[PDB]
Each structure stands twice: as structure tokens, then as C-alpha cells.
Amino acid sequence: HHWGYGKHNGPEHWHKDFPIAKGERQSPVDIDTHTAKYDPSLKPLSVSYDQATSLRILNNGHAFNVEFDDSQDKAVLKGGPLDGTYRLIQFHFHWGSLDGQGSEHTVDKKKYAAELHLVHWNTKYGDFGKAVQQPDGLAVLGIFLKVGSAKPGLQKVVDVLDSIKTKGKSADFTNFDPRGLLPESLDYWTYPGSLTTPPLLECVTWIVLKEPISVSSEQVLKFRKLNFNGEGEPEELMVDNWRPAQPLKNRQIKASFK
Numbered sequence: 001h002h003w004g005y006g007k008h009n010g011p012e013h014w015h016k017d018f019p020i021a022k023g024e025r026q027s028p029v030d031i032d033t034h035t036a037k038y039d040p041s042l043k044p045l046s047v048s049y050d051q052a053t054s055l056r057i058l059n060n061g062h063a064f065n066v067e068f069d070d071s072q073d074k075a076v077l078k079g080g081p082l083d084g085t086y087r088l089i090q091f092h093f094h095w096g097s098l099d100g101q102g103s104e105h106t107v108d109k110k111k112y113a114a115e116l117h118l119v120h121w122n123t124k125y126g127d128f129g130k131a132v133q134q135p136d137g138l139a140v141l142g143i144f145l146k147v148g149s150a151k152p153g154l155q156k157v158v159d160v161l162d163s164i165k166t167k168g169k170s171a172d173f174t175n176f177d178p179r180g181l182l183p184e185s186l187d188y189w190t191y192p193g194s195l196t197t198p199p200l201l202e203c204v205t206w207i208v209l210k211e212p213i214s215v216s217s218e219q220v221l222k223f224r225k226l227n228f229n230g231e232g233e234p235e236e237l238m239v240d241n242w243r244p245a246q247p248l249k250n251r252q253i254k255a256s257f258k
């Protein structure tokens with residue numbers, strides 16, 4: 001009876017196995033755009049993805065992860081609110097059953113169709129498993145998806161999903177360039193938070209870009225053909241794999257922009 005996104009094992013149940021679910025810095029949150037304050041001390045974000053080495057795509061039963069070689073400093077995130085160098089390890093998405101829901105963060109209570117998470121770990125902690133035990137261990141770059149024009153740089157991901165339909169399936173996924181998933185502007189909001197899935201560790205500096213990317217209805221329909229189940233189990237479509245907004249508590253969301 002493992003955690004998931006059903007009526008019986010969904011986000012309102014997670015606190016029984018993971019009591020940090022009711023903690024002081026949980027994610028996601030609603031971004032109240034009027035309450036977020038410009039922080040002129042933040043720096044421009046530095047997204048350095050030219051040497052990124054993708055390896056594999058995995059259906060883990062919760063989402064799909066595009067994994068990177070993080071055994072050297074290739075694809076890194078620096079600057080903004082961050083001290084030091086964070087290495088890209090994987091990206092994944094959260095999405096809805098309908099275009100009106102699917103994001104984890106919200107903006108003035110608006111839900112987007114989906115949300116991309118580019119996950120990075122602080123190199124001063126040596127490995128990803130040590131980094132998740134630290135309050136500044138991870139930096140997750142969050143990007144909203146809205147339905148409209150196709151995102152050409154997403155299509156290579158869309159086209160491999162038939163090969164990882166079910167939980168535990170993986171496929172080789174080399175030479176994928178994550179620069180093709182970024183919007184034009186790197187204007188962002190930032191706040192201290194958590195992983196949005198169990199184990200819900202409070203180890204994330206969240207960096208959420210203001211500018212959504214556009215994907216087509218056909219691209220997101222292909223996400224919704226994935227399965228939560230394993231092969232040879234009853235088909236359960238992988239949709240609504242999002243955690244709703246959590247209390248802000250004693251936190252301030254800072255804006256990089258006026």
C-alpha cells in the first residue's frame with residue numbers, strides 16, 4: 001500500500017508514512033505575485049547546459065525522469081539565490097488529466113497544464129544522496145507548461161514515451177539538449193522548500209520561472225497515455241501526478257524582477 005496519487009494513497013495520506021508532509025517548509029506553494037517582493041540582491045540565474053549528457057529515460061511509476069551523467073561538472077545551475085555549483089541530475093514533469101490542472105506551484109491560484117522540474121544537487125555534498133539530507137542540498141528549476149503552440153525541443157521526449165509506457169521501463173536517451181525546454185526569460189521567484197513527493201525532504205531551493213513554455217495539446221495528450229502500473233497490471237493512466245499547494249508558513253517568496 002505504497003504512496004501515489006489515488007484516493008487511497010494520494011497527497012492527503014502521505015503524512016502517515018512521511019510526517020514531514022506537515023512540516024515548516026513544504027512544497028509546492030501558491031505564488032502570490034502581489035506579496036512576492038523584488039530582491040535586488042539576487043543575481044541573474046546562470047543555466048549552463050551546453051555540455052549536458054543525457055543517458056536514459058525511466059518511468060518510475062510516479063513520473064518519467066530524463067537522467068543525466070552527473071559524474072562531472074557539465075550541466076550546472078549557479079547564481080540567482082544559490083551559493084556554489086549545482087549539477088543537473090534529472091528532469092521530470094507533473095501534469096493533469098485536463099488542461100486546467102497539472103502544475104504543482106500555482107500563480108495567484110492559477111494552475112497550469114503541467115510543470116517541468118530540472119533537479120540539481122549542490123556539489124559541495126559530493127553525491128545526490130548526501131545532498132538531500134541538507135537544507136541547501138538541491139536546487140529545482142520549475143517551469144510552467146501551458147497548452148498552445150508545440151514546443152519543438154520537447155518532441156524527442158514525447159516520441160520515446162511509447163517505449164516506457166509502464167512502471168520500471170527505461171530506454172536509452174542520449175544527446176537530448178535541455179536548453180530546448182527553457183523559455184526566453186529567466187525571470188523567477190524563489191523560496192526555500194521541499195521535494196514535492198515522498199520522502200518530502202526539506203532540502204530544496206526552489207527557482208520558479210515566471211514565463212511558461214507552450215506545448216501542444218497533442219504533446220500533453222502523449223504524457224497522459226503513460227501508465228502508473230507495471231506491465232501486465234490493470235491500466236491506470238499516469239495523470240494528475242501533482243501535489244497541491246501547501247501552507248507558506250514562515251516563508252517569503254522573493255522575485256528576481258520588478
Ligand SMILES: NS(=O)(=O)c1ccc(CCNC(=O)Nc2ccc(I)cc2)cc1
Nearest residue numbers: 117119128129132140194195196197199
Ligand atoms: N518533484 S521534485 O522536483 O520536488 C523531486 C522529488 C523527488 C526527487 C527524488 C528523491 N529521491 C531521494 O530522496 N533520493 C534518494 C537517494 C538515495 C537514497 I539511499 C534514498 C533516496 C527529486 C525531485
Ligand SMILES: [Zn+2]
Nearest residue numbers: 092094117196
Ligand atoms: Zn517534481
